[PDB]
């Protein structure tokens, strides 16, 4: 934020939009009484218009406590959200444990029963590797360094194709 804010008890919110927490202001010309209803607890406070102007003095400056970085946490997040897309279609595999009985054994051709048993073990291999969730924390660490080398350029970090095309046209179509 900037050093100065210009809001507070002037076109302020008056009510709550949820029933999970209820807020009722009593804003007068000098002060304001906010009796907020929230669960089994309740608070009825007292703020003036110049009492909200003392809010944004010392800024909050939020930050993201991450394991490796925020970048690597975002690439690991995308890898987990892709592993969900794969896992949801291992969630629609048909059950074969209903066909592990010996009655389906001896009616079955030997080659086709062998291929069914190999298919079941292939499903167990797929499901054991798609839920190795501790491997994504290192799997995203191979996507990072080429990306970090592509932002560490000699001209600008956020430079790319179409901005360079626009500045190439602007450089060429001027008088030399």
């Amino acid at each position: 934020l900037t050093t100065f804010t210009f809001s507070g008890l002037q076109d302020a919110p008056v009510a709550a939009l949820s029933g999970s927490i209820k807020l009722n202001v009593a804003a007068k010309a000098g002060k304001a009484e906010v009796t907020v209803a929230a669960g089994a607890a309740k608070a009825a406070t007292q703020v003036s218009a110049a009492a909200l102007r003392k809010l944004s003095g010392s800024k909050i400056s939020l930050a993201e406590v991450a394991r490796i970085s925020v970048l690597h946490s975002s690439i690991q997040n995308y890898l987990l959200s892709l592993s969900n897309e794969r896992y949801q279609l291992l969630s629609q595999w048909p059950d074969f444990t209903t066909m592990y009985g010996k009655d389906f054994y001896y009616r079955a051709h030997p080659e086709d029963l062998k291929k069914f048993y190999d298919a079941a073990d292939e499903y167990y291999k797929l499901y054991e590797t798609v839920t190795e969730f501790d491997s994504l924390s290192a799997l995203a660490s191979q996507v990072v360094p080429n990306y970090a080398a592509r932002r560490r350029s000699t001209v600008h970090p956020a430079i790319g194709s179409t901005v360079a095309d626009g500045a190439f046209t602007n450089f060429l179509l001027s008088k030399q």
Binding site: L1, L55, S56, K59, I60, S61, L62
Partner: peptide, 10 residues
């Protein structure tokens, strides 16, 4: 409004 008046920067 609350992010402004509370003065959180993220």
């Amino acid at each position: 409004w609350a992010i402004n008046t509370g003065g959180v920067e993220h």
